[PDB]
RNA sequence: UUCCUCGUGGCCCAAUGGUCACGGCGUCUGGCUACGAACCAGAAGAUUCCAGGUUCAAGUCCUGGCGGGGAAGCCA
RNA sequence: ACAUACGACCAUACCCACUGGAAAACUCGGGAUCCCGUCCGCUCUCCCAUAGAUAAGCCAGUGAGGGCCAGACUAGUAGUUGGGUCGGUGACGACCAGCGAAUCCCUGGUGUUGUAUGUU
RNA sequence: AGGUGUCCUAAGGGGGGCUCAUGGAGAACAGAAAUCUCCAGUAGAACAAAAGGGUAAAAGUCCCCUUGAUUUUGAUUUUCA
RNA sequence: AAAGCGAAUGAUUAGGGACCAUUCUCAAACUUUAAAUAUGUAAGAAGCCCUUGUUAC
């Protein structure tokens, strides 16, 4: 609109939480990123060098280039009627590995273990995840707890 | 054990009105009295009623430690006739007083370096204070190791053999 | 009740007049207020009252509510 | 007219504590984040720090690598370990730092298996020398590289911190280096006085102080250096004492030898520790004490 | 309503952000005169319209309010 | 298990007050020639490790301590997505299919852990 | 509801030491405001200039040294076709 | 959105004890908290495991 520069509307997005501002934990610098990793961008306002625009804050992408203290990220930006490849140079201070990819990577390793174990044992196993299924028949015992009869309560109390 | 009061330091302050020959002379009397090079103090901000400007040299002071600090203190109390108001003792264990006519301390009077007054302030501690001044693992002195007003006045009476009221 | 009935004619819309089950401006039922008063869990401090809790300095609580511990 | 409480309870509620090592005043996280930061295109290549700490009565030298879950100690060397090599006095002087640095450097290469490849400066002469790549059959082999970490110690000319750093470089460990802070370096004229430097290496500066004390104040010499004269080690016996101290480290870096009787295991003092440990009260223990305190003050 | 301008000793006015400040009249004291004017010697007198902000410092620079003045309010 | 050096999470770890701390370590400590830096050997720097001390730092325990952390209640409440030719003059509200908080009072807890070197 | 068409050889760059606004207590002139000392003090100060983020062994303040405010063209981001 | 002010900032009512402990009511340009709806990415053969090869990084 009237003012359309960078950092416009980032009063809360680029700030820091109430009691965790000040010094930046050093575990961020000790994480190691390879090409092909999937990372989440979360701009830290305490470091004003090498930020990413507010559109990419909270987005996720694939690392494509690794340089000294920053990495390149390929992010698909929706621009009206199409998506556009966007290559973002963002410092390792503004990113973190995505746990969704890690959860997938523990699953792909696990699927190999069950398939290897099943083939050696000699029975087939299911690898695909299955959504929640309708409940089967079950019997409920009332030997300890019996049903409690509850009825709607009167308006009674005005306050 | 190690709970003996000592004269941690003694600061002699001379706050003349302005900067110039008068302040330079105040440096000479402080240097002659203490034997150390003094340091000038600049003004925090300008005020019209007081006739001072911002970043203007106003006062001059030295810090004296050790036996030389002890002998200056007794000379000052000699001028005060070994008399101090009980108000002169701060609750943090520190105390101090002020004198006029610095000649009374034994300095030879000379025209050209006229009459100057001084403030004598004494810092009292115990042999454990380094834990708050060292660069590494700086911390705070314990509550029971802190020097109160009642302790320093008792030390002052029993050691300098003076009178406080 | 008649005082509030006259006053509500000066306001737009509908206003209701209701009797509060609480004791005065305190947010306690009349039965509860009597129980706290008998137990000494109340401190008359001006136009209002203060209550006794299980948290805080023991001496301060027992000094402010001497009757609640006798 | 009357001031208010600065603390009250909102100050505590909104108070954000510093990092624990910062509150304890032991770590400089501003310098630590620069010492410990590897280029991202050097994916898994540790940055080794030469940690040099000077406690009272001791010197601690460590080769430390950084990990997400903490720090790893590659090797260590303590000044109190020099007693096996014959260093009984001045365990925290400048020369003891040089020997400890030499001892750590030999231990690192032996752990790496590079002791026969890099030997550095075999005989210390106080010369500004950088550990260069060794020439072997395969060609050049770059020396092991570590960085100095002074912590909160001041980096002034002649400090003992650079004494350990000098001792490590002479051992065979490459350390980024400069002579501006060695003893005998003149700031006005940028030259390094080698004779002054090798004087400090072999405990020389202590010798003239013992010499000057003997001439001027016999009583002060007695008080300061009573242990020296008791063990019959004169001024001229210092530079020779450090001579075989360096040689003994070169030949054997893991010499335990000296011990104080009796030897011991770990378990039975853990039982000793638990015997001296106090325990917190329980809910009913806390509740009972409150009831007792109420009764005492009510009757009072 | 809009735009612009001004507010300083009892009166009328001028003013270089760096000393609460100027000029004339007016007021006060002494002298000359029998006395008063005129005349000659000297003194005192300002919450710089008000409330905020910048700067080390505001009458001066910025905002708002108060009082006053000027200019525009047209085609139907 | 305890101590020390370097740490990780960065208050369950912080702030105030009281009490106690076997071994070792940490610390306070003694001196100012050289290196070094100050108005001042206060800090920093260097030398001593003999003398003295757990007084302080440090650790531990205590406090119906302040705070912090977690739970319960608040509450299926406030709010909100979709629906009706639903109610009401309206402001708004109920219902159908779903999602679903946050205070005040109340209760419990008061660091966990890694590498390396040692400890009676 | 406000701002810009400027200002800075430092108010740019590196390194080191220190902690700020404020409050309490105390010292000759000295008082509500001069300078000195101690204690507390999570930023309530400062960072050229509007406002918003950010910063405490600093990004603030003082000291030391400098000109990376240089050369070569590329890749990427925001407004965007 | 809601909520909060015996929590920071700002606004605000009343009494009480010597500033302190309370009390009523608020915030588009306040906030310790914090939804619903919408929103980014992943759910593999261009993948995974073992041995080994190339390089001037
Ligand atoms: Mg945020
Ligand atoms: Mg920049
Ligand atoms: Mg540093
Ligand atoms: Mg700095
Ligand atoms: Mg709302
Ligand atoms: Mg809330
Ligand atoms: Mg409020
Ligand atoms: Mg989703």
UniProtKB/Swiss-Prot annotation, chain B:
GO biological process terms, semicolon-separated: translation
CC per GO annotation: cytosolic large ribosomal subunit
First-listed, main subcellular location of the protein, grouped into a coarse class: cytoplasm
Tree of life domain: Eukaryota
Keyword RNA-binding in record: yes
Coiled coil spans: none
Key words of the record: Cytoplasm, Ribonucleoprotein, Ribosomal protein, RNA-binding, rRNA-binding
InterPro entries: Ribosomal_uL5, Ribosomal_uL5_C, Ribosomal_uL5_CS, Ribosomal_uL5_dom_sf, Ribosomal_uL5_N
Keyword rRNA-binding belongs to the record: yes
One Pfam family matching this protein: Ribosomal_L5_C
Function: Component of the ribosome, a large ribonucleoprotein complex responsible for the synthesis of proteins in the cell. The small ribosomal subunit (SSU) binds messenger RNAs (mRNAs) and translates the encoded message by selecting cognate aminoacyl-transfer RNA (tRNA) molecules. The large subunit (LSU) contains the ribosomal catalytic site termed the peptidyl transferase center (PTC), which catalyzes the formation of peptide bonds, thereby polymerizing the amino acids delivered by tRNAs into a polypeptide chain.
Name of the molecule in the record: Large ribosomal subunit protein uL5
Gene that encodes the chain: rpl-11
UniProtKB/Swiss-Prot annotation, chain D:
Cell compartments where the protein resides: Cytoplasm
Species in which this protein is naturally found: Neurospora crassa (strain ATCC 24698 / 74-OR23-1A / CBS 708.71 / DSM 1257 / FGSC 987)
Family listed: Belongs to the universal ribosomal protein uL18 family.
Keyword Membrane set for record: no
Listed Pfam families: Ribosomal_L18_c, Ribosomal_L5e
GO cellular component: cytosolic large ribosomal subunit
Gene3D superfamilies registered for this protein in UniProt: 3.30.420.100
One biological process term in Gene Ontology: translation
Protein name as it appears in the record: Large ribosomal subunit protein uL18
Main location: cytoplasm
Subunit note: Component of the large ribosomal subunit (LSU). Mature N.crassa ribosomes consist of a small (40S) and a large (60S) subunit. The 40S small subunit contains 1 molecule of ribosomal RNA (18S rRNA) and at least 32 different proteins. The large 60S subunit contains 3 rRNA molecules (26S, 5.8S and 5S rRNA) and at least 42 different proteins.
Entry GO MF terms: 5S rRNA binding; structural constituent of ribosome
Positions in coiled-coil regions: none
PANTHER family attached to this UniProt entry: LARGE RIBOSOMAL SUBUNIT PROTEIN UL18, RIBOSOMAL PROTEIN L5-RELATED
InterPro entries tied to this protein: Rbsml_uL18_euk (IPR005485), Ribosomal_uL18_C_euk (IPR025607)
Protein's job: Component of the ribosome, a large ribonucleoprotein complex responsible for the synthesis of proteins in the cell. The small ribosomal subunit (SSU) binds messenger RNAs (mRNAs) and translates the encoded message by selecting cognate aminoacyl-transfer RNA (tRNA) molecules. The large subunit (LSU) contains the ribosomal catalytic site termed the peptidyl transferase center (PTC), which catalyzes the formation of peptide bonds, thereby polymerizing the amino acids delivered by tRNAs into a polypeptide chain.
Keywords annotated in UniProt: Cytoplasm, Ribonucleoprotein, Ribosomal protein, RNA-binding, rRNA-binding
């Amino acid at each position: 609109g009237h003012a359309a520069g960078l950092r416009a509307g980032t009063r809360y997005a680029f700030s820091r939480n109430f009691r965790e501002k000040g010094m930046i934990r050093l575990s961020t610098y000790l994480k190691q990123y390879k090409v092909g990793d999937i990372v989440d961008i979360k701009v830290n306002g305490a470091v004003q060098k090498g930020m990413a625009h507010k559109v990419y804050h909270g987005k996720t992408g694939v690392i494509y280039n690794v340089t000294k203290s920053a990495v390149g990220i390929i992010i698909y930006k929706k621009v009206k009627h199409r998506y556009i490849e966007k290559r973002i140079n963002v410092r390792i201070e503004h990113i973190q590995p995505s746990r969704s990819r890690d959860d997938f990577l523990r699953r792909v390793k696990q699927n190999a273990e069950l398939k290897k174990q099943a083939k050696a044992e000699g029975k087939p196993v299911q690898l695909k995840r299955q959504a929640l299924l309708p409940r089967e028949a079950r019997t409920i015992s009332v030997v300890d707890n019996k049903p409690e009869t509850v009825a709607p309560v009167a308006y009674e109390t005005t306050i | 054990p190690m709970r003996e009061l000592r004269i941690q330091k003694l600061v002699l302050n001379i706050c003349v009105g302005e900067s110039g020959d008068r302040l330079t002379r105040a440096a000479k009397v402080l240097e002659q009295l203490s034997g150390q090079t003094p340091v000038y103090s600049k003004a925090r901000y300008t005020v019209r009623t007081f006739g001072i400007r911002r970043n203007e040299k106003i006062s001059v002071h030295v810090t004296v430690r050790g036996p030389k600090a002890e002998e200056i203190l007794e000379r000052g109390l000699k001028v005060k006739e070994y008399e101090l108001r009980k108000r002169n003792f701060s609750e943090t264990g520190n105390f101090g007083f002020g004198i006029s006519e610095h000649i009374d301390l034994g300095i030879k009077y000379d025209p050209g370096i006229g009459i100057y007054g001084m403030d004598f302030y004494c810092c009292m501690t115990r042999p454990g204070e380094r834990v708050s001044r060292r660069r590494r693992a700086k911390s705070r002195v314990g509550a029971t190791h802190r020097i109160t007003r009642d302790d320093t006045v008792k030390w002052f009476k029993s050691r300098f053999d003076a009178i406080v009221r | 009740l008649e005082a509030l009935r006259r006053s509500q004619y000066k306001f737009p819309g509908r206003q209701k007049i209701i009797i509060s089950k609480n004791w005065g401006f305190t947010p306690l039922r009349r039965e509860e207020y009597l129980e706290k008063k008998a137990a000494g869990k109340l401190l008359i401090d001006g136009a209002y009252v203060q209550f006794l809790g299980n948290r805080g300095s023991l001496e301060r609580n027992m000094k402010r509510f001497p009757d609640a511990f006798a | 007219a009357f001031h208010k409480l600065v603390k009250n309870s909102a100050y505590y509620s909104r108070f954000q504590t510093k990092y624990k090592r910062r509150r304890e005043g032991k770590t400089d996280y501003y310098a630590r984040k620069r010492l410990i930061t590897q280029a991202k295109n050097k994916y898994n290549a540790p940055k080794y720090r030469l940690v040099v700490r000077f406690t009272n009565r001791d010197i601690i030298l460590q080769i430390v690598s950084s990990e997400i879950t903490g720090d790893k100690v590659f090797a260590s060397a303590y000044s109190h370990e020099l007693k096996a090599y014959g260093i009984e006095h001045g365990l925290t002087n400048w020369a003891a730092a040089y020997a400890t640095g030499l001892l750590l450097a030999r231990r690192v290469l032996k752990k790496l298996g590079l002791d026969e490849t890099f030997k550095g400066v075999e005989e210390a002469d106080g010369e500004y020398k950088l550990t260069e790549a060794a020439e072997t059959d395969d060609g050049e082999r770059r020396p092991f590289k570590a960085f100095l970490d002074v912590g909160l110690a001041r980096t002034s000319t002649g400090a003992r911190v650079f004494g350990a750093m000098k001792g490590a470089s002479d051992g065979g460990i490459f350390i980024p280096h400069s002579e501006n802070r060695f003893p005998g370096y003149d700031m006005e004229s940028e030259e390094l006085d080698a004779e002054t430097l090798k004087k400090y290496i072999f405990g020389g500066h202590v010798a003239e102080y013992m010499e000057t004390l003997a001439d001027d104040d016999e009583e002060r010499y007695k008080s300061q250096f009573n242990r020296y004269i008791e063990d019959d080690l004169e001024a001229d016996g210092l530079e020779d004492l450090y001579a075989e101290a360096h040689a003994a480290i070169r030949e054997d870096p893991f010499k335990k030898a000296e011990s104080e009787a009796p030897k011991k295991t770990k378990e039975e003092w853990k039982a000793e520790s638990l015997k001296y440990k106090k325990s917190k009260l329980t809910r009913e223990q806390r509740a009972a004490g409150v009831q007792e305190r109420i009764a005492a003050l009510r009757s009072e």
